[PDB]
Amino acid sequence: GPKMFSNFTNQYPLSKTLRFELKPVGKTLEHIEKKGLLEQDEKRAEDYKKVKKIIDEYHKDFIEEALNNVKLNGEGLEEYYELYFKKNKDDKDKKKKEFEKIQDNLRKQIVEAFKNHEKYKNLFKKELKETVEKFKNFTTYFTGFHENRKNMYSDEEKSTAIAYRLIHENLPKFLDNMKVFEKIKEKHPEAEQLEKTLKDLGEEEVLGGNNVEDIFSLDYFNHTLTQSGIDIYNTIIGGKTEEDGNKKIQGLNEYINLYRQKNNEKNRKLPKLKPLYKQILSDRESLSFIPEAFENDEELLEAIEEFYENLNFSNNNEATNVLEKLKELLSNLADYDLNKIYIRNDTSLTDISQKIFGDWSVIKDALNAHYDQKWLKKQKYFSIAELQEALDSYCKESDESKEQKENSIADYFKTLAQTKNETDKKKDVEKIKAFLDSIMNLQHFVKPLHLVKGGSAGAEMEKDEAFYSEFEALYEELSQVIPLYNKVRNYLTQKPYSTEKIKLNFENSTLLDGWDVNKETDNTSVLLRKDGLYYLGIMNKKHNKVFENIPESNENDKCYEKMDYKLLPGANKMLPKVFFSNKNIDYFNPSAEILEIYDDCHKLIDFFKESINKHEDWKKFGFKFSPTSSYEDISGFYREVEQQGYKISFKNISESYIDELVDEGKLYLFQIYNKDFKPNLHTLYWKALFDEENLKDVVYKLNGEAEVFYRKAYTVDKFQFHVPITMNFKAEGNSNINDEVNEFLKGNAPDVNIIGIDRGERHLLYLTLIDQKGKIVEQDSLKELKEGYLSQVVHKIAKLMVEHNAIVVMEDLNFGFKRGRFKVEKQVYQKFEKMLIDKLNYLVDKDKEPNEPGGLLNAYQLTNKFESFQKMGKQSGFLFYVPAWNTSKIDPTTGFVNLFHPRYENVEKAKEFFNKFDSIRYNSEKDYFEFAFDYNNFTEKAEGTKWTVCTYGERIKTYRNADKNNQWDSKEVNVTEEFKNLFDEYNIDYKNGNDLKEAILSQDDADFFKSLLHLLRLTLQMRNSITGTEIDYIISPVANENGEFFDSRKADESLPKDADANGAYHIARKGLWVLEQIKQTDDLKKVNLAISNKEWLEFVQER
Label residue 604 exposed, middle or buried (CB < 10 Å: 0-12, 13-18, 19+): buried
Residue 671 vs 888, nearer CB to Mg ion: 888
Q: Crossing angle of helices 348-356/408-418, nearest 10°?
A: 90
Residue 47 vs 758, nearer CB to Mg ion: 758
Residue 757's SS3 state is: strand
Give least dist CB 817 to Mg ion, A.
10
Give least dist CB 1023 to Mg ion, A.
8
Give least dist CB 759 to Mg ion, A.
5
* Distance, CA of 35 to CA of 538 (rounded, Å): 14
Residue 369 vs 459, nearer CB to Mg ion: 369
Q: Per rule CB under 5 A, is residue 833 in the interface with Mg ion?
A: no
Residue among 659, 655, 652 nearest 558 (CA): 655
Tell me the CA distances in angstroms from 274 to 270, 277, 860, one per residue in order: 12, 9, 68
Residue 50's SS3 state is: helix
- H/E run at residue 640: helix 634-645
Give least dist CB 1060 to Mg ion, A.
6
* Distance, CA of 202 to CA of 190 (rounded, Å): 19
Question: How many residues are recorded in the chain?
Answer: 1103
* Distance, CA of 993 to CA of 221 (rounded, Å): 97
Tell me the CA distances in angstroms from 720 to 463, 495, 499, 534, one per residue in order: 56, 18, 10, 14
Give least dist CB 1065 to Mg ion, A.
10
Map the footprint of Mg ion across residues 326-385, applying CB under 5 A: none
Map the footprint of Mg ion across residues 1062-1081, applying CB under 5 A: 1063
* Distance, CA of 77 to CA of 71 (rounded, Å): 10
* Span interacting with Mg ion, options 492-500, 518-526, 556-564, 753-761, rule CB under 5 A: 753-761
* Distance, CA of 894 to CA of 810 (rounded, Å): 23
Give least dist CB 568 to Mg ion, A.
51
Residue 885 vs 929, nearer CB to Mg ion: 885
Give least dist CB 350 to Mg ion, A.
18
* Distance, CA of 387 to CA of 366 (rounded, Å): 9
Residue 475 vs 880, nearer CB to Mg ion: 880
Give least dist CB 761 to Mg ion, A.
6
- H/E run at residue 503: strand 500-506
Query: Residue 270 carries which DSSP code?
Result: P
Q: Which residues is 505 bridged to in the sheet?
A: 524, 705
Residue 442 vs 1074, nearer CB to Mg ion: 1074
Residue 758 vs 1058, nearer CB to Mg ion: 758
Residue 448 vs 1063, nearer CB to Mg ion: 1063
Map the footprint of Mg ion across residues 851-890, applying CB under 5 A: 888
Residue 948's SS3 state is: strand
Residue 360 vs 468, nearer CB to Mg ion: 360
Tell me the CA distances in angstroms from 712 to 37, 51, 80, 692, one per residue in order: 10, 24, 52, 38
User: Amino acid identity of 415?
Assistant: T
Give least dist CB 823 to Mg ion, A.
9
Give least dist CB 1064 to Mg ion, A.
7
Residue 875 vs 888, nearer CB to Mg ion: 888
Residue 488 vs 809, nearer CB to Mg ion: 809
Map the footprint of Mg ion across residues 881-940, applying CB under 5 A: 888
HEC string for 170-230: HHHHHHHHHHHHHHHHHHCCCCCCCCCCCCCCCCCCCCCCCCHHHHCCHHHHHHHHCHHHH
Give least dist CB 1062 to Mg ion, A.
7
Please report, for the chain, how many H helices and E strands are present, in that order: 41, 24
Residue 46's SS3 state is: helix
- b/e map 976-1005, b = 16+ CB within 10 Å: bebbbebbeeeeeebeeeeebbebbeebee
Give least dist CB 1053 to Mg ion, A.
19
155, 758, 833, 891: which one binds Mg ion (CB under 5 A): 758
CB neighbour list of residue 247: distance below 8 Å, 6 or more residues apart: none
Give least dist CB 768 to Mg ion, A.
11
Give least dist CB 760 to Mg ion, A.
5
CB neighbour list of residue 27: distance below 8 Å, 6 or more residues apart: 662, 663, 665
Q: Phi/psi at 910 (nearest 5 deg)?
A: -65, -40
DSSP letter string, 339-389: SS-EEE-STHHHHHHHHHTS-TTHHHHHIIIII----TT--SEEEHHHHHH
Residue 888 vs 893, nearer CB to Mg ion: 888
Number of residues that bind Mg ion (CB under 5 A): 3
Give least dist CB 820 to Mg ion, A.
6
* Span interacting with Mg ion, options 461-469, 758-766, 838-846, 943-951, rule CB under 5 A: 758-766
CB neighbour list of residue 817: distance below 8 Å, 6 or more residues apart: 368, 884, 885
Give least dist CB 1055 to Mg ion, A.
16
Residue 446 vs 1034, nearer CB to Mg ion: 1034
Residue 742 vs 888, nearer CB to Mg ion: 888
Give least dist CB 361 to Mg ion, A.
12
* Span interacting with Mg ion, options 253-261, 276-284, 754-762, 802-810, rule CB under 5 A: 754-762
Residue 249 vs 809, nearer CB to Mg ion: 809
Map the footprint of Mg ion across residues 1004-1063, applying CB under 5 A: 1063
Map the footprint of Mg ion across residues 167-196, applying CB under 5 A: none
* Distance, CA of 11 to CA of 735 (rounded, Å): 6
Tell me the CA distances in angstroms from 723 to 20, 101, 504, 521, one per residue in order: 8, 55, 10, 18
Residue 876 vs 888, nearer CB to Mg ion: 888
HSE-up of residue 299 (Cα within 13 Å, Cβ side) = 17
Give least dist CB 1074 to Mg ion, A.
16
Residue 638 vs 766, nearer CB to Mg ion: 766
The residue number whose beta carbon is nearest to Mg ion equals 1063
Residue 766 vs 929, nearer CB to Mg ion: 766
Q: Which residues are near Mg ion by CB under 5 A? A: 758, 888, 1063
